[PDB]
Design an enzyme around this catalytic site. Structure first.
Site, mmCIF file in Angstrom:
data_model
loop_
_atom_site.group_PDB
_atom_site.id
_atom_site.type_symbol
_atom_site.label_atom_id
_atom_site.label_comp_id
_atom_site.label_asym_id
_atom_site.label_seq_id
_atom_site.Cartn_x
_atom_site.Cartn_y
_atom_site.Cartn_z
ATOM 1 N N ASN A 43 37.593 31.637 28.557
ATOM 2 C CA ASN A 43 36.779 33.474 28.226
ATOM 3 C C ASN A 43 38.049 34.449 28.468
ATOM 4 O OD1 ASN A 43 34.729 35.489 28.936
ATOM 5 N ND2 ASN A 43 35.656 36.310 30.538
ATOM 6 N N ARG A 99 29.106 39.618 28.789
ATOM 7 C CA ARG A 99 29.344 39.036 27.947
ATOM 8 C C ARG A 99 30.633 38.567 27.073
ATOM 9 N NH1 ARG A 99 24.062 36.101 26.785
ATOM 10 N NH2 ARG A 99 24.881 34.262 28.054
ATOM 11 N N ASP A 108 39.340 40.344 27.802
ATOM 12 C CA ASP A 108 38.310 39.543 27.620
ATOM 13 C C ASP A 108 38.364 39.415 26.008
ATOM 14 O OD1 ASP A 108 35.457 38.272 28.742
ATOM 15 O OD2 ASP A 108 34.519 40.081 26.713
ATOM 16 N N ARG A 168 36.003 21.163 32.281
ATOM 17 C CA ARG A 168 35.032 22.554 33.034
ATOM 18 C C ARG A 168 35.480 23.891 31.754
ATOM 19 N NH1 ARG A 168 36.010 26.888 36.737
ATOM 20 N NH2 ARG A 168 34.630 26.844 37.448
ATOM 21 N N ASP A 206 34.964 27.081 31.769
ATOM 22 C CA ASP A 206 35.474 28.249 33.059
ATOM 23 C C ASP A 206 34.111 29.933 32.324
ATOM 24 O OD1 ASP A 206 36.393 29.596 35.740
ATOM 25 O OD2 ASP A 206 37.167 31.325 34.089
ATOM 26 N N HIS A 240 29.952 34.585 30.776
ATOM 27 C CA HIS A 240 30.474 35.423 30.023
ATOM 28 C C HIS A 240 30.776 35.321 28.783
ATOM 29 C CE1 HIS A 240 30.251 37.482 34.176
ATOM 30 N NE2 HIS A 240 31.038 35.992 35.009
ATOM 31 N N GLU A 284 30.480 26.368 34.083
ATOM 32 C CA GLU A 284 29.987 27.068 35.194
ATOM 33 C C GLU A 284 29.284 28.233 34.696
ATOM 34 O OE1 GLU A 284 32.525 30.019 36.172
ATOM 35 O OE2 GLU A 284 32.230 30.117 38.255
ATOM 36 N N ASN A 334 31.791 24.470 45.757
ATOM 37 C CA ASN A 334 33.074 24.289 44.874
ATOM 38 C C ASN A 334 34.430 24.448 45.026
ATOM 39 O OD1 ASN A 334 32.252 26.833 44.146
ATOM 40 N ND2 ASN A 334 32.250 26.712 42.287
ATOM 41 N N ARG A 376 30.083 16.236 41.319
ATOM 42 C CA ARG A 376 31.126 16.524 41.540
ATOM 43 C C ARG A 376 31.780 16.067 43.479
ATOM 44 N NH1 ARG A 376 32.875 21.961 39.296
ATOM 45 N NH2 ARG A 376 32.141 22.043 41.019
HETATM 46 C C1 ARE Z 1 33.948 34.243 40.203
HETATM 47 C C2 ARE Z 1 32.750 33.729 40.226
HETATM 48 O O1 ARE Z 1 32.138 35.548 39.743
HETATM 49 C C3 ARE Z 1 30.861 35.354 38.401
HETATM 50 O O2 ARE Z 1 30.592 35.069 39.758
HETATM 51 C C4 ARE Z 1 29.270 35.775 39.665
HETATM 52 C C5 ARE Z 1 27.965 35.787 39.059
HETATM 53 O O3 ARE Z 1 28.091 35.585 38.096
HETATM 54 C C6 ARE Z 1 26.768 36.864 39.527
HETATM 55 O O4 ARE Z 1 25.576 35.934 39.086
HETATM 56 C C7 ARE Z 1 26.778 36.633 41.043
HETATM 57 O O5 ARE Z 1 26.273 35.572 42.048
HETATM 58 O O6 ARE Z 1 28.391 37.413 41.876
HETATM 59 C C8 ARE Z 1 28.914 36.237 41.160
HETATM 60 C C9 ARE Z 1 30.442 37.496 41.862
HETATM 61 O O7 ARE Z 1 31.196 38.068 40.710
HETATM 62 C C10 ARE Z 1 31.529 34.676 37.131
HETATM 63 O O8 ARE Z 1 30.491 34.250 36.680
HETATM 64 C C11 ARE Z 1 31.965 33.214 37.551
HETATM 65 O O9 ARE Z 1 32.809 32.316 36.912
HETATM 66 C C12 ARE Z 1 33.428 33.298 38.508
HETATM 67 N N1 ARE Z 1 33.954 31.585 38.283
HETATM 68 C C13 ARE Z 1 35.106 31.473 37.698
HETATM 69 C C14 ARE Z 1 35.493 32.887 36.812
HETATM 70 C C15 ARE Z 1 37.247 32.845 37.660
HETATM 71 C C16 ARE Z 1 37.089 33.908 36.049
HETATM 72 O O10 ARE Z 1 38.176 32.970 35.744
HETATM 73 C C17 ARE Z 1 37.105 32.293 38.593
HETATM 74 O O11 ARE Z 1 37.213 34.061 39.925
HETATM 75 C C18 ARE Z 1 39.308 33.688 39.991
HETATM 76 O O12 ARE Z 1 39.792 34.277 39.490
HETATM 77 C C19 ARE Z 1 39.979 36.104 38.887
HETATM 78 C C20 ARE Z 1 41.578 35.949 38.132
HETATM 79 O O13 ARE Z 1 42.644 35.679 39.165
HETATM 80 C C21 ARE Z 1 39.878 36.617 40.891
HETATM 81 O O14 ARE Z 1 40.579 37.875 40.488
HETATM 82 C C22 ARE Z 1 41.272 38.475 41.197
HETATM 83 O O15 ARE Z 1 42.289 38.803 40.076
HETATM 84 C C23 ARE Z 1 41.351 40.047 39.053
HETATM 85 C C24 ARE Z 1 42.158 40.493 37.605
HETATM 86 O O16 ARE Z 1 42.010 41.823 37.781
HETATM 87 C C25 ARE Z 1 41.595 41.348 40.730
HETATM 88 O O17 ARE Z 1 41.018 42.216 39.255
HETATM 89 C C26 ARE Z 1 40.350 40.703 41.413
HETATM 90 O O18 ARE Z 1 40.368 41.507 42.532
HETATM 91 C C27 ARE Z 1 41.457 39.534 41.722
HETATM 92 O O19 ARE Z 1 40.258 38.722 43.113
HETATM 93 C C28 ARE Z 1 38.744 36.087 41.013
HETATM 94 O O20 ARE Z 1 38.540 36.850 42.553
HETATM 95 C C29 ARE Z 1 38.679 34.327 41.707
HETATM 96 O O21 ARE Z 1 37.661 34.499 42.328
HETATM 97 C C30 ARE Z 1 36.855 31.261 39.206
HETATM 98 O O22 ARE Z 1 37.086 30.719 40.322
HETATM 99 C C31 ARE Z 1 36.168 30.642 38.468
HETATM 100 O O23 ARE Z 1 35.157 29.606 39.215
HETATM 101 CA CA CA Z 2 33.428 37.221 27.696
HETATM 102 CL CL CL Z 3 31.889 24.930 38.914
#
Ligand code: ARE
Ligand code: CA
Ligand code: CL
Ligand code: NAG
EC number: 3.2.1.1
Length: 496
Positions: A100, A158, A167, A195, A197, A201, A233, A298, A337
Site C-alpha cells: 500500500n 484509501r 501512499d 498476507r 498488509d 487502505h 488485513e 496478532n 493462525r
Molecule cells: C497498525 C494498523 O493501523 C490501521 O488500523 C486502524 C483500523 O483500521 C481502524 O479501524 C482503527 O481500529 O484504528 C486502527 C489503528 O489505527 C490500519 O488500518 C492497519 O492496516 C494497520 N496494521 C498493518 C499496517 C501497518 C502499516 O504498514 C503496520 O503498522 C506498523 O508500521 C508503521 C510503519 O513503521 C508504524 O508507524 C510508525 O512509523 C510512522 C512513519 O510515518 C510514524 O508516523 C508512526 O508514529 C510510527 O509508529 C505503526 O505504528 C506500526 O503499527 C502494522 O504492523 C500492520 O499490521
Molecule cells: Ca492507499
Molecule cells: Cl494480520
C-alpha cells in the site's frame, strides 16, 4: 485465492514474527513438518528503512525502500533456501506483502536501509524500484494534512497517507506492474500465498487488478492451476463505512472481531460467559467461515497497536491464552493462525506500554538465533508459543478432527462448557470459580484416551490425565478451577 494450498491434513499456519530465514528453514525440518503445521507467515522480506531512533523497532519492517530481498532476516539466497527446504517437507511459506505504501514521508533521505539502497522520501524518489513523484497519491488525497484524518470517509482512508506512509498510486498500471513483479518473483521462488498488509487502505478493485497479474504457483511443488492463497488485513469491528465483505472477491480476510470477542468472553468482561459460545461463528456477526482467517492475537494487538484493545489475550496471560487458543483450534470456524512471539520489556505507564516499539532479540541490531532447550522450549527470549505442549497438541487436534461436525455441546449456564467434533474429538472447559465433575456424552468410541493438554501419548501410555470412555460414549471429566490448565482435550489419535 481462498484455499491455503497447505498439504492434505495440515490445517494451521504459524506466524514466526521476526525470525531469521535460516531459523525458519531448520524449524520447518526439525519441528513444523513432523508436528503437522501447515505453513509459516514470515515478516516482510523486502528491504526496509533502518530506524535508529528508537533502536531498530519491529515496525521499521513496514516501511519499504525497495523490493530487494534483503533484510535483518537474511538475503535472497537465504530466503530461497528457506522456501525450498520448507516446501520439501510440506510446510508452506506465506509472505507479508507491504504494497500500500513505501516509507514515512518524514524519513531522512540517504542510505539508511537494510541493503544500502538510496531513497529520498522528501522528493518521492525510490530509484531502487524505481518509483518517482508520479507514482504516489499526493495529488489525489484531499485532506489538509495529507494523512488519513477520519475513518468515516472511505475515500481518504484509501487515497491518503496511513500515519504518514507515502501512499502508492495503485490505479496506475506501472505501479500495479512493479508490485506484481515483486510478488511474481516470490511466487516463482515457491511461496504459497500472501498476507496483504493494510488492505483497508487499498480499493478492492486495485487489489484485484494486481492479483490478475499473478502467476500460478510453482509447478515443481504445486498442482497445475494452483492460485496463491490471499488473506487481506482489514480491521472491521463494525462502526465504519468500509466493510470486510467488500474484499471477498479477492480472497480471505482477517476477522479481528474473533480475537476481540473471544478475549472478552474468556476474561468474563461485561458479564459475558463461555456458555454464550454455543452459536460461536457467523451467529456472532462474523464473516462467512470460508472467507475468514482467525487468530487470538496478532503482531499488532499483542502490543497495543491495531485494534482489539485491552481484551486481547496474549502469551503474557499464559493460563487464559492457552484456553483461548485451545477453543479456537477445536472450533470448526475459519482458517487458524497461531502466533509465535518474542519477549520484550513491557513497561506500563498510565495504562500504556512505553516499550511497544522494541524489536526482536538482538546483539547490536543483529537478530539472535532461535536456540532450543532440552525441554523443547526456546531460549534467547523467543517465546515459541507454537512449541508449548498445550498449543502444539491442539494444532494436531485440529488436523485429526478436520471435516467433523460441531456436536454434543454442553454448558452449565455459566463458564463450564464442552463439545465434540464428530466421533474424532472432544474438549471440555472450566472457566468458573469452582470445580467441574460430571459424566458427559462424547460421541467417541469406547476406550482409554490420553488428555493432550496435561500430557502426551507415549510408548503406549499417557504421561498426564487419562479419560475412560464407555460403550455408550459417556466419560467422566474432573477439572478443578485450580488446575494448571483448566481444560481437557482427547481425540482419535490420543486413544490407547
Ligand atoms: C497498525 C494498523 O493501523 C490501521 O488500523 C486502524 C483500523 O483500521 C481502524 O479501524 C482503527 O481500529 O484504528 C486502527 C489503528 O489505527 C490500519 O488500518 C492497519 O492496516 C494497520 N496494521 C498493518 C499496517 C501497518 C502499516 O504498514 C503496520 O503498522 C506498523 O508500521 C508503521 C510503519 O513503521 C508504524 O508507524 C510508525 O512509523 C510512522 C512513519 O510515518 C510514524 O508516523 C508512526 O508514529 C510510527 O509508529 C505503526 O505504528 C506500526 O503499527 C502494522 O504492523 C500492520 O499490521
Ligand atoms: Ca492507499
Ligand atoms: Cl494480520
Ligand atoms: C505403560 O505404563 C505403565 C505404568 O503406568 C508401565 O507399566 C508399562 O510398561 C508402560 N507400557 C509401555 C509399553 O512402556
Amino acid at each position: 485465492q481462498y484455499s491455503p494450498n497447505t498439504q492434505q491434513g495440515r490445517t494451521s499456519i504459524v506466524h514466526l514474527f521476526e525470525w531469521r530465514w535460516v531459523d525458519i528453514a531448520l524449524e520447518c525440518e526439525r519441528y513444523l513438518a513432523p508436528k503437522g503445521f501447515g505453513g509459516v507467515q514470515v515478516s516482510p522480506p523486502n528491504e526496509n528503512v533502518a530506524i535508529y531512533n528508537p533502536f531498530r523497532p519491529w515496525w521499521e519492517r513496514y516501511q519499504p525502500v525497495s523490493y530487494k530481498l534483503c533484510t535483518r532476516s537474511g538475503n535472497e539466497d537465504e530466503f530461497r533456501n528457506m522456501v525450498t527446504r520448507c516446501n520439501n517437507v510440506g510446510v508452506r511459506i506465506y509472505v507479508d506483502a507491504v504494497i500500500n505504501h513505501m516509507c514515512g514521508n518524514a524519513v531522512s533521505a540517504g542510505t539508511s536501509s537494510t541493503c544500502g539502497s538510496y531513497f529520498n522520501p522528501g522528493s518521492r524518489d525510490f530509484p531502487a524500484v524505481p518509483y518517482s513523484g508520479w507514482d504516489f497519491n499526493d495529488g489525489k488525497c484531499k485532506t489538509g494534512s495529507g494523512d488519513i484524518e477520519n475513518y468515516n470517509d472511505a475515500t481518504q482512508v484509501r487515497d491518503c497517507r496511513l500515519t504518514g506512509l507515502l501512499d502508492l498510486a495503485l490505479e496506475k498500471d506501472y505501479v500495479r506492474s512493479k508490485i506484481a513483479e515483486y510478488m511474481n518473483h516470490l511466487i516463482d521462488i515457491g511461496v504459497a500465498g500472501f498476507r496483504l498488509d493494510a488492505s483497508k487502505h487499498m480499493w478492492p478493485g486495485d487489489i484485484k487488478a494486481i492479483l490478475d497479474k499473478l502467476h500460478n504457483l510453482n509447478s515443481n511443488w504445486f498442482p497445475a492451476g494452483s492460485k496463491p492463497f490471499i488473506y487481506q488485513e482489514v480491521i472491521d469491528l463494525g462502526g465504519e463505512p468500509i466493510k470486510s465483505s467488500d474484499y471477498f472477491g479477492n480472497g480471505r480476510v482477517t476477522e479481528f472481531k474473533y480475537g476481540a470477542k473471544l478475549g472478552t468472553v474468556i476474561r468474563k468482561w461485561n458479564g459475558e460467559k463461555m456458555s454464550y459460545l454455543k452459536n460461536w461463528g457467523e451467529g456472532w456477526g462474523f464473516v462467512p467461515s470460508d472467507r475468514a482467517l482467525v487468530f487470538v492475537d496478532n503482531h499488532d494487538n499483542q502490543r497495543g497497536h491495531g485494534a482489539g484493545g485491552a481484551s486481547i489475550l496474549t502469551f503474557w496471560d499464559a493460563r487464559l491464552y492457552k484456553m483461548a487458543v485451545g477453543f479456537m483450534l477445536a472450533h470448526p470456524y475459519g482458517f487458524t493462525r497461531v502466533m509465535s512471539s518474542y519477549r520484550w520489556p513491557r513497561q506500563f505507564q498510565n495504562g500504556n506500554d512505553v516499550n511497544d516499539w522494541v524489536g526482536p532479540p538482538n546483539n547490536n541490531g543483529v537478530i539472535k538465533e532461535v536456540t532450543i532447550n532440552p525441554d523443547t522450549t526456546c531460549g534467547n527470549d523467543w517465546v515459541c508459543e507454537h512449541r508449548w505442549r498445550q498449543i502444539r497438541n491442539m494444532v494436531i487436534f485440529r488436523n485429526v478432527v478436520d471435516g467433523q461436525p460441531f456436536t454434543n455441546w454442553y454448558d452449565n449456564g455459566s463458564n463450564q462448557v464442552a463439545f465434540g467434533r464428530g466421533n474424532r474429538g472432544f474438549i471440555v472447559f472450566n472457566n468458573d470459580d469452582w470445580s467441574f465433575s460430571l459424566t458427559l456424552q462424547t460421541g467417541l468410541p469406547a476406550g482409554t484416551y490420553c488428555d493432550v493438554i496435561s500430557g502426551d501419548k507415549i510408548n503406549g501410555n499417557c504421561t498426564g490425565i487419562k479419560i475412560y470412555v464407555s460403550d455408550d460414549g459417556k466419560a467422566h471429566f474432573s477439572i478443578s478451577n485450580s488446575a494448571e490448565d483448566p481444560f481437557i482435550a482427547i481425540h482419535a489419535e490420543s486413544k490407547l
